[PDB]
Amino acid sequence: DDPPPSTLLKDYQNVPGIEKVDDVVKRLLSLEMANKKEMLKIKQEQFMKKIVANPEDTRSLEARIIALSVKIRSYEEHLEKHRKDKAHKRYLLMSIDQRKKMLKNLRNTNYDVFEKICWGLGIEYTFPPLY
Amino acid sequence: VDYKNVQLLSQFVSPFTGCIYGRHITGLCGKKQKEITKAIKRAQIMGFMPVTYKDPAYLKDPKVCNI
Amino acid sequence: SRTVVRDVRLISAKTGYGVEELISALQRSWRYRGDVYLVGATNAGKSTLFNTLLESDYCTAKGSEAIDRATISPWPGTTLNLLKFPICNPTPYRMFHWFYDTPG
Amino acid sequence: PMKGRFPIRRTLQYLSQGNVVFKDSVKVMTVNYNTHGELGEGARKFVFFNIPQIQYK
Amino acid sequence: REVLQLQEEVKNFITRENLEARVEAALDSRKNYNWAITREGLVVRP
Amino acid sequence: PRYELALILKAMQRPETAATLKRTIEALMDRGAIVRDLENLGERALPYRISAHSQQHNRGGYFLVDFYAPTAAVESMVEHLSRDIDVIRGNIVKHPLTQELKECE
RNA sequence: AAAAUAGACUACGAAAGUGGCUUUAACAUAUCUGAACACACAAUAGCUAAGACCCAAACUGGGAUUAGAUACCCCACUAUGCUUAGCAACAGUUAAAUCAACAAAACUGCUCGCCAGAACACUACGAGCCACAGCUUAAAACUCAAA
Ligand SMILES: [Mg+2]
Ligand SMILES: [Mg+2]
Ligand SMILES: [Mg+2]
């Protein structure tokens, strides 16, 4: 599910006094009047809060997996409309491959975080075919 | 560089043909050349600037072109 | 007229050698139109060929299971119930009919 | 010439230069080493130079 | 600073209340986006 | 986001121009927009003859409507401009002020 | 329908490719090598179905021309050109005598694929299509001291 359109942008969510503000400025500063990239940023921020131990550390493998997952969701939403977009088809298939690679590395290094990631993002890890 | 500033954009077209000058004539750095080109086309298609000639009202502006 | 032999073709129903070429030959000419009557002797091996040809593109299959694809009918004028499956007309008859096994 | 860096490792003289002959109790050697990190340099060299001799003996 | 700037700016927006008045005021005003440049890189206001 | 509507309206008398401006701004607000400013660039001869709604125009009034609209609004508004008969030409662009000056030094 | 100027630009894209304007989506990946067999694309032939047909146009007709005319000029119109659906890599070096020659200055390391005379020779014992007489489809022997 997407964030509500009334949610404030990530950059305008900790500014002091944002609750003492007129409705019109709230609309101007919401996801209703921004392109899709802020909504994806909000999704990423929510997942980082929900899954990882340190939401601020973005270089960790779990953070990269979450980022690639939101990107993959974006590609699937895009291809649901542009069925003949071969470039974005390539991008989606590749991104799935590297997310599988990151999941393999996380499994081999940190199993607890791997379980948490797989539960939080609804990812079913599958072992590669032998032939 | 704004597409509505037809005076500035007319300082970079041929008075007799309306063709856009190149950077060897205008002397602009390539980035501003690209901005001027895109602005000129935007103005032409949005009904702000003539295409086959330079608007006569702007024939007496300073000549910044080496032609 | 008198009995006319159009072709002599070596097959082997067990290994399916020459069966596909037989189907291609049957689906390439103007004169091979209509019903097919698979005559033969007892040990000629008719049943194996019938089973082979039954499970192929030659048959107009409506289902996959060989029980329904082929039907049993009494031979006209007798009680000899025999198998049969429906076939396709050869290709020249779309640009511009039943199989029959007889007693050995 | 002989292929690979340090081809002398692939000579029976080098392989028999090893001096480690294990007691009958030892059955398994597992060697955990890191490909990167200066502190493991000797360990890396241990894998490169002396494992063939140990296995040979 | 951006938020405060919007606090001050949102006051003078065309709502559905002051629509007609602002439309007439716009019809009673003209704006000019044309300026010229010299070889010295100086803006020559019209 | 923030958009600018450049509008070329038919050369008409003031009451009808006001009516058309009210109608278009009302459409913008109906599609979810917050209109910021309305600026009149003036009545002027067109750079070239423009054929619209089975009529040939040589003169027109130029207007700018700054607004903030939800992204899905733009396409709809375009369709509406395609139906209004008093508009020779309407074009919606991302507002130039949002594009921040590149640091060419 | 396809995009003069900018473009004396050399950007984007994995490659093929992309240069009219606006808007919306949107441009994978924090080591490298590793696919005939996995997934995506891309191009090149040749046929098969239907469809459009302005224009051009192999073939095919018609007209004019020397003294075997123009093969070559003109007219008309096909297939076709169109639209669908189908059939060496990577990292580091310039130190050395660089250096069979010719190209394209030579190098290392590391990995994959490939190579061990002419010979990717020749040949139809046969096979398929055909249905008496034709078409398509091969390796090996064998020979030689060359290539
Ligand atoms: Mg690889
Ligand atoms: Mg023709
Ligand atoms: Mg390779």
Side-chain angles (χ1 to χ4, degrees):
Chain A
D1 189 317
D2 311 312
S6 80
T7 186
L8 279 294
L9 302 181
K10 181 177 183 291
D11 307 300
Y12 304 144
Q13 205 144 36
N14 275 27
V15 65
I18 193 66
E19 70 278 17
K20 188 171 168 62
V21 169
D22 185 352
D23 267 22
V24 177
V25 187
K26 293 182 187 292
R27 272 189 83 206
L28 292 180
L29 295 174
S30 78
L31 286 189
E32 182 65 26
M33 293 180 183
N35 51 19
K36 191 175 178 178
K37 303 281 186 84
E38 292 83 3
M39 177 256 285
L40 298 174
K41 274 162 45 161
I42 294 282
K43 276 178 175 285
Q44 177 165 9
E45 190 276 331
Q46 282 174 354
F47 281 135
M48 287 291 249
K49 273 162 48 51
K50 180 171 74 174
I51 291 156
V52 298
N54 169 335
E56 293 82 3
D57 183 29
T58 304
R59 296 294 86 193
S60 50
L61 186 60
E62 40 271 34
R64 295 162 56 204
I65 289 161
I66 285 163
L68 199 51
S69 297
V70 295
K71 216 173 287 213
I72 285 154
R73 181 66 178 171
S74 187
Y75 293 148
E76 300 184 326
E77 298 271 323
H78 170 98
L79 281 166
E80 267 175 30
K81 171 167 173 44
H82 309 278
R83 299 292 180 90
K84 65 179 72 66
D85 200 322
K86 302 305 190 205
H88 282 92
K89 204 184 170 164
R90 186 193 161 236
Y91 281 126
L92 176 70
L93 295 172
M94 277 191 311
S95 298
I96 283 166
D97 279 0
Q98 292 83 18
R99 191 181 59 184
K100 276 176 184 148
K101 195 196 295 200
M102 302 192 162
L103 279 160
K104 182 194 58 176
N105 304 350
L106 191 57
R107 194 180 166 278
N108 291 331
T109 52
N110 202 329
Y111 206 81
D112 189 358
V113 181
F114 166 76
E115 293 179 353
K116 186 66 70 66
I117 292 283
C118 276
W119 156 78
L121 301 166
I123 303 167
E124 293 179 353
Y125 184 75
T126 61
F127 294 89
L130 289 176
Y131 299 97
Chain B
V1 176
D2 194 32
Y3 73 102
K4 302 182 289 297
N5 183 0
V6 184
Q7 180 152 53
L8 173 73
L9 304 175
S10 289
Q11 286 182 267
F12 305 102
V13 296
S14 164
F16 292 165
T17 63
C19 294
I20 305 161
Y21 297 152
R23 69 197 63 198
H24 62 291
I25 291 157
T26 66
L28 292 175
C29 78
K31 180 172 72 69
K32 302 293 286 186
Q33 179 71 38
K34 183 58 61 64
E35 293 179 353
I36 287 280
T37 305
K38 185 176 180 180
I40 284 167
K41 291 185 179 66
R42 192 185 268 191
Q44 284 173 350
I45 289 157
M46 283 170 187
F48 279 82
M49 191 173 158
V51 66
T52 61
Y53 57 87
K54 184 189 310 212
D55 189 358
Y58 308 126
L59 279 171
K60 63 184 181 293
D61 291 331
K63 184 178 184 293
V64 292
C65 311
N66 323 301
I67 190 167
Chain C
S1 287
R2 61 199 295 265
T3 312
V4 60
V5 189
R6 322 307 325 198
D7 204 10
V8 167
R9 301 183 61 80
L10 276 60
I11 60 171
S12 167
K14 297 183 289 296
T15 62
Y17 159 77
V19 182
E20 185 63 26
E21 292 84 314
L22 179 64
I23 294 160
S24 305
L26 290 180
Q27 290 177 323
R28 191 170 65 241
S29 179
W30 293 97
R31 38 173 166 165
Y32 301 154
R33 64 181 293 165
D35 294 296
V36 180
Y37 299 92
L38 182 49
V39 185
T42 51
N43 213 56
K46 305 198 330 196
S47 296
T48 311
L49 188 68
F50 192 93
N51 287 313
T52 305
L53 291 169
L54 176 57
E55 61 184 1
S56 81
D57 291 331
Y58 190 50
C59 167
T60 57
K62 277 74 70 178
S64 184
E65 291 80 5
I67 296 90
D68 186 284
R69 295 179 66 251
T71 72
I72 303 94
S73 81
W75 193 254
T78 70
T79 79
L80 317 162
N81 294 25
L82 294 144
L83 275 293
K84 60 188 286 181
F85 64 88
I87 55 171
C88 295
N89 292 320
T91 59
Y93 286 90
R94 294 179 188 86
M95 308 186 320
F96 293 101
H97 279 137
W98 288 94
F99 203 94
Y100 287 129
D101 177 72
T102 76
Chain D
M2 294 177 71
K3 295 159 178 295
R5 279 181 311 125
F6 300 98
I8 179 158
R9 296 176 301 142
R10 293 162 39 226
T11 69
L12 292 180
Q13 184 178 2
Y14 183 90
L15 289 178
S16 79
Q17 268 167 33
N19 63 7
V20 180
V21 183
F22 287 131
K23 302 206 262 213
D24 291 331
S25 55
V26 184
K27 300 289 94 175
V28 182
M29 185 180 288
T30 61
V31 179
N32 283 81
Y33 74 105
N34 295 331
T35 56
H36 282 95
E38 183 178 1
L39 290 186
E41 181 67 74
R44 279 192 299 275
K45 267 190 189 283
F46 179 72
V47 168
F48 194 86
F49 289 111
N50 308 121
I51 294 294
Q53 294 170 316
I54 290 158
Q55 191 70 89
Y56 190 71
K57 300 293 289 184
Chain E
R1 269 89 60 87
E2 200 150 56
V3 172
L4 300 174
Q5 184 178 2
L6 295 173
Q7 296 294 141
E8 289 201 57
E9 285 176 355
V10 63
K11 289 188 286 184
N12 276 262
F13 280 10
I14 294 168
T15 74
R16 183 177 292 171
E17 190 277 331
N18 61 342
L19 178 61
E20 58 89 20
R22 296 291 297 271
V23 169
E24 186 65 26
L27 290 162
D28 299 345
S29 187
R30 281 75 177 272
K31 280 77 173 176
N32 189 356
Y33 289 90
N34 314 126
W35 53 261
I37 197 81
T38 63
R39 298 185 152 265
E40 296 82 3
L42 305 175
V43 65
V44 178
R45 292 327 296 187
Chain F
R2 195 174 165 173
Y3 297 107
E4 187 176 80
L5 167 57
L7 210 55
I8 305 179
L9 294 189
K10 184 168 72 72
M12 294 182 286
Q13 318 162 108
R14 174 159 309 195
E16 182 65 26
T17 310
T20 299
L21 285 174
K22 179 175 170 66
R23 184 175 55 241
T24 187
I25 285 155
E26 174 272 308
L28 280 192
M29 292 180 183
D30 181 88
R31 276 145 184 87
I34 299 157
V35 180
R36 178 153 155 141
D37 279 12
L38 166 73
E39 295 137 26
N40 171 14
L41 307 171
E43 183 141 30
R44 55 176 86 150
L46 267 52
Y48 39 78
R49 171 177 47 253
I50 298 174
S51 56
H53 302 93
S54 83
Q55 194 295 331
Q56 297 278 4
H57 309 263
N58 292 96
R59 272 186 83 85
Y62 287 64
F63 292 94
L64 287 182
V65 182
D66 199 339
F67 60 103
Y68 298 83
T71 293
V74 175
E75 180 160 40
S76 193
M77 186 65 203
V78 166
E79 173 268 342
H80 169 269
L81 293 170
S82 305
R83 183 180 63 83
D84 189 358
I85 68 183
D86 291 331
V87 176
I88 297 89
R89 187 160 285 184
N91 276 48
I92 297 156
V93 296
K94 292 183 288 185
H95 202 269
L97 290 184
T98 63
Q99 287 69 240
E100 190 276 331
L101 286 174
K102 182 63 69 177
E103 294 293 328
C104 204
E105 294 87 4

